[PDB]
């Protein structure tokens, strides 16, 4: 599973093999065809997940030294449009998630 | 299969024709009969046919 964090704290879920497959010399495909992002909304961090179990938490580390902890079970089911997972301020971005 | 003269003189001449006039008697059973015989549901129609035409004819006592 793939968890995508955008520039506004949005979270989306996806499978790895659903991504475009190409060769070494190929350019790629625009990710806008796969996620309903904004015109200037871009991913900044990806957290692979094997399966959901227990009630373990997800530690989120952003820029400017901000921390946050949330329960994983909130991300067990997601719609086409993601739900806000963190209230960011100004030009603060998630850089590390585990 | 009839010539026009025969058709006129047997059915359309007011001097020697016979007809029927349609009237309504109850107006509360007519709705039920029309709904049963001309409606979308099939099972009431099948039951009506089976009860009337099939079994009642075999025993006219």
């Amino acid at each position: 599973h793939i968890l995508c964090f955008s520039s506004r704290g949005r979270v989306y879920s996806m499978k790895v093999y659903q991504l475009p497959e190409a060769t070494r010399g190929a350019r790629g495909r625009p990710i806008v065809n796969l996620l309903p992002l904004e015109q200037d909304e871009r991913i900044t961090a990806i957290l692979p997940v094997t399966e959901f179990e227990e009630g373990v938490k997800v530690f989120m580390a952003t820029a400017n030294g901000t921390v946050k902890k949330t329960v994983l079970t909130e991300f067990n089911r997601l719609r086409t449009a993601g739900k806000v997972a963190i209230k960011l301020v100004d030009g603060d971005e998630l850089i590390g998630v585990d | 299969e009839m010539n026009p003269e025969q058709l006129w003189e047997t059915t359309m001449d007011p001097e020697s024709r016979r007809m029927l006039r349609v009237t309504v008697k109850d107006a509360i059973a007519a709705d039920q009969l029309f709904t049963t015989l001309m409606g979308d549901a099939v099972e009431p129609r099948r039951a009506f046919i089976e009860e009337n035409a099939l079994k009642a004819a075999n025993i006219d006592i």
Partner: protein
């Protein structure tokens, strides 16, 4: 003179007449030979004409004219459409009519008009009408009382199981798939 009538009685009588006629004489097959009345009349007319499996072909118009002029009081286009279906290898498991000309294709093409084609009886169709002249079945009257038609055929083939049937009536319908002849014969022997 004018006499009154109630609407309920008229509705009931007319609809019961139509329903019973359609159920008993147009759309369902007999369990003994597996044929509808139109199939039986077509086969009987072809047998009377002398249209055998090892003789020359005859034009379809002649057969249709005989059928609708002596036995079947309906239109001719539907009779021709009925005759066409009994000769297509992708419709019947064992064909009953032998055709010469353009009779359509599995691709969806239509058959030619009846001024262009020719037909005769198939070899297996002679086993459906064996011993017909030795008083083995009953005969009934036509719509005028001038000719006579068989009531059922003295068949040697279990036609209903090996060819199937499909028809729509008032209040009921039928749908039977075709089978293989050797297996049915073995089952009958068992």
């Amino acid at each position: 003179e004018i006499t009154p009538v109630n609407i309920e009685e008229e509705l009931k009588s007319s609809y019961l007449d139509y329903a019973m006629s359609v159920i008993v004489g147009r759309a369902l097959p007999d369990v003994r030979d597996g044929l509808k009345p139109v199939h039986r009349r077509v086969l009987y007319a072809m047998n009377v004409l002398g249209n055998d499996w090892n003789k020359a072909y005859k034009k379809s118009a002649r057969v249709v004219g005989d059928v609708i002029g002596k036995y079947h009081p309906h239109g001719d286009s539907a009779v021709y459409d009925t005759i066409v279906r009994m000769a297509q290898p992708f419709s019947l498991r064992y064909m009953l009519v032998d055709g010469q000309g353009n009779f359509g294709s599995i691709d969806g093409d239509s058959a030619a008009a009846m001024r262009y084609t020719e037909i005769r009886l198939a070899k297996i169709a002679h086993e459906l009408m064996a011993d017909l002249e030795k008083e083995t079945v009953d005969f009934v009257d036509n719509y005028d009382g001038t000719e006579k038609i068989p009531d059922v055929m003295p068949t040697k083939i279990p036609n209903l199981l090996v060819n199937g049937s499909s028809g729509i009536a008032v209040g009921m319908a039928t749908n039977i798939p075709p089978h293989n002849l050797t297996e049915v014969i073995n089952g009958c022997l068992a």
